[PDB]
């Protein structure tokens, strides 16, 4: 059929030119039913038409069409556990979005797509319904009602084919979980393929690190319940006999470094195969070959196994590639942070040869700051150079400010409140400013802190701190005295070894002391400082302004920060008053902790703690009685009341503030007092020595599935505190508090774990050696912040 003209009926958005173009047929050509059907199918495929009809009028080829209504909006109702924006992202990724049209036959398809998304996020009983609201001018809104349903949780994790290790002992090291008590924080009970693969890898490692080279995971099975609210996992394996490590043999283009390696491949012939050690050998060889320039030194380990004698023989293949050089290093995504903040963390220098280990180190160092959510790397090449490359670190910034509140409880500090506002990257500079405050039964503290972590390129820091501290003693199991102090402090920090850290600084502190109970160990200092107060009254004030030089050293080698198993921590602190200050005194403290394991799985441990301290004055003066040392409690010696170990107070005969019988008073003249007066309320001492020997074991009655999250210990604590300036000749009848032989011992049990309320630590101790005046407190605990 000849066509002398073309006409359309229904073209609203698509222009007439676009239609005339997409059509195979044009004006002035012969046409048949086949070409008409082709045109109709093309119009249908344009995705903008719903119903098409190409008929023949008297002379003209008339094209009727009902354009698919243009989508004006996409609403949602019932997306509780799914963000509207993420759902819209998934949708517009599927193809449907605003501006386009609505295919009136793909409703159920989109419904099933969203249902599949819900099946992927955990929910399997979800029901999606797409309602369609027409609107004039051929527009349409698409509403999506979601019935989410109930999530599915794991009810069981089983392992079959295991005979040497119980399934619980293996699940204990998984990220998935089947039991989640209300008194522990061990994880959720949800299912994800990524976690499953991670757990399979963990199991394979647990087995390869014991001699089971022929370990094989036959298959895995995931199953549901007919109600689709429970999930079941099953893992079949085949653990083969244990294998030894007979020898090692290297071969490849070692680059003449065959001497520096055979010392890395030395073993005790007849050892137990292990995968961690093999990977460590490989990483060491790679680090060496990087030290010698090579950037991608491939290393492969192939084991040749012999079942007759059960001997493994490793075969290491080394391919040291070519040397690559770095021309640039770029950072994209740092709209707030400056380039120096990201560059001073790079261990790979620009303008030098390449090392991928150093690039990974830089990535990890950038991850630790906390200023970036994601950190990705890309080592691009250089157009027209086979030995040059440009490194690129892509980053996504994160908010740094932090409002914070916190609550806690404990026997020592009663109820403890904390509150602070922090900022870690002030205007993209690295500075960390903050305002913090703490409040407990016997002290308030408020500090304003600032610090630059790089005052020098090497990593040296320079801090800064203003502080206000109010301290009531009667609330701390001591003699009565209120100290209100305010001051400032600055300090530098020097890192030298990645574990050792020195620090040195200056400080000023003003102290005001009031509401002081007459006692001998206080006048001994007052007199020294020129004062001459009265004994028959406690309206006594004393102000001092002191400048101090503070020094310190820290050593940290613990394998872990939470529940360590091997290593040692050590801290030395010291302070000395420099001339000009009213007070002249020096003070020193040394804390030490040492964890030693006695097994291979690190479940039986021997912990040893010590705390030494000594201070004294210089110009015939004494040390302030508000800088003294205190022992007793859940940190130094357990089984005793906090801050009771040591010297006690020897009061004077003195009227009281406001007398009211039925209240216990400490040797007031209004009660028949005419001479000095022993007491049981502690004051502290200038010298202190404390020790603790603890034995950490596994929790015996709690399931092995999550008994690795609870720590059980049996401890023996010892302690003594004493004053060196007590003249036992003048005050005869009362004991000698300058004797360190008065050692206080205790022994008992302790538990420690993590709870939603916060960390928990319980302790029951029974002091068998204690002296007159020491108050016992067997049960102790602390629900910390």
């Amino acid at each position: 059929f000849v066509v002398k003209d073309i006409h359309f009926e229904g073209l609203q958005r698509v222009a007439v030119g676009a239609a005339l173009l997409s059509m195979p047929v044009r004006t002035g050509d012969t046409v048949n039913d086949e070409d008409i059907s082709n045109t109709i199918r093309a119009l249908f495929a344009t995705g903008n038409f719903e119903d098409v009809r190409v008929l023949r009028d008297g002379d003209t080829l008339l094209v009727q069409v009902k354009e698919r209504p243009t989508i004006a909006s996409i609403t949602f109702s019932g997306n509780k556990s799914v963000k509207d924006d993420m759902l819209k992202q998934n949708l517009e990724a599927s193809g449907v979005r605003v501006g386009e049209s609505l295919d009136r036959t793909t409703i159920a398809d989109i419904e099933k797509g969203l249902e599949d998304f819900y099946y992927s996020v955990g929910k399997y009983s979800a029901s999606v319904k797409a309602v369609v609201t027409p609107l004039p001018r051929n527009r349409v809104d698409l509403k999506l009602v979601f019935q989410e349903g109930v999530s599915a949780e794991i009810q069981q994790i089983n392992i079959v084919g295991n005979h040497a290790f119980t399934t619980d002992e293996l699940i204990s090291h998984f990220q998935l979980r089947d039991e989640v008590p209300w008194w522990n924080v061990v994880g959720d009970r949800k299912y994800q393929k990524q976690k499953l693969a991670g757990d399979l890898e963990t199991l394979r490692s647990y087995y390869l690190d014991r001699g089971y080279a022929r370990f094989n995971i036959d298959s895995t099975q995931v199953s549901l319940t007919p109600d689709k609210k429970g999930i079941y996992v099953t893992v079949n394996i085949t653990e083969g006999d244990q294998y030894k490590l007979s020898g090692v043999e290297v071969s490849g283009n070692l680059a003449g470094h065959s001497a520096e390696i055979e010392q890395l491949t030395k073993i005790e012939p007849g050892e137990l195969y292990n995968g961690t050690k093999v990977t460590k050998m490989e990483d060491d060889i790679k680090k060496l070959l990087g030290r010698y320039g090579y950037a991608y030194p491939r290393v492969q380990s192939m084991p040749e196994i012999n079942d007759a004698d059960k001997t493994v023989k490793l075969r290491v293949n080394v391919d040291a590639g070519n040397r690559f050089y770095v021309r640039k290093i770029r950072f994209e995504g740092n709209d707030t942070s400056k380039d120096a903040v990201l560059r001073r963390e790079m261990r790979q220098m620009e303008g030098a040869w390449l090392g991928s280990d150093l690039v990974d180190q830089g990535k990890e160092r950038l991850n630790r700051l906390g200023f970036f959510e994601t950190v990705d790397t890309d080592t691009q090449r250089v157009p027209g150079s086979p030995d040059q490359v440009d490194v690129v670190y892509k980053v996504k910034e994160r908010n740094t400010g932090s409002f914070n509140f916190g609550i806690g409880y404990g026997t020592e500090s009663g109820v403890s409140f904390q509150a602070g506002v922090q900022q870690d990257n002030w205007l993209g500079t690295g500075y960390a400013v903050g305002i913090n405050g703490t409040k407990n039964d016997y002290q308030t503290y408020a500090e304003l802190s600032v610090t630059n972590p790089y005052f020098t390129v090497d990593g040296v820091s320079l801090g800064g701190r203003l502080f206000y501290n109010d301290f009531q003693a009667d609330d701390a199991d001591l003699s009565d005295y209120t100290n209100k102090s305010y001051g400032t402090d600055v300090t530098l920090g020097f890192p030298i070894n990645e574990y050792n850290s020195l620090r040195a600084g200056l400080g000023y502190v003003h102290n005001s002391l009031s509401n002081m109970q007459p006692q001998v160990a206080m006048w001994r200092y007052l007199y020294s400082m020129g004062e001459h107060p009265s004994t028959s009254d406690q309206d006594n004030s004393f102000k001092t302004d002191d400048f101090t030089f503070n020094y310190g050293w820290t050593y940290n080698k613990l394998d872990r920060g939470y529940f360590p198993t091997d290593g040692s921590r050590v801290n030395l602190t010291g302070k000395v008053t420099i001339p000009g200050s009213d007070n002249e005194y020096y003070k020193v403290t040394l804390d030490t902790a040492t964890y030693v394991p006695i097994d291979d799985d690190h479940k039986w441990v021997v912990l040893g703690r010590t705390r030494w301290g000594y201070g004294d004055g210089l110009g015939g003066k004494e040390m302030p009685f508000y800088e003294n040392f205190y022992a007793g409690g859940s940190s130094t010696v357990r089984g005793f009341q906090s801050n009771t170990i040591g010297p006690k107070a020897v009061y004077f005969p003195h009227q009281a503030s406001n007398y009211d019988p039925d209240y216990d008073y400490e040797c007031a003249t209004q009660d028949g007092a005419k001479d000095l007066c022993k007491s049981d309320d502690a004051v502290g001492g200038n010298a202190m020595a404390v020790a603790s020997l603890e034995f950490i074991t596994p929790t015996p009655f709690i399931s092995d599935k999550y008994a690795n999250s609870v720590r059980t210990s049996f401890f023996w604590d010892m302690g003594t505190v004493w004053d060196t300036n007590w003249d036992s000749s003048q005050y005869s009848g009362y004991p000698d508090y300058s004797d360190p032989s008065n050692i206080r011992m205790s022994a008992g049990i302790a538990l420690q774990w993590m709870s939603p309320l916060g960390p928990l630590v319980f302790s029951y101790a029974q002091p068998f050696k204690k002296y007159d005046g020491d108050k016992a407190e067997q049960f102790q605990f602390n629900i910390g912040k």
Binding site: T400, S402, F403, F405, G406, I407, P756, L757, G758
Partner: peptide, 7 residues
């Protein structure tokens, strides 16, 4: 208990 609220 310890609540942090990154503003």
């Amino acid at each position: 208990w310890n609540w942090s609220k990154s503003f």
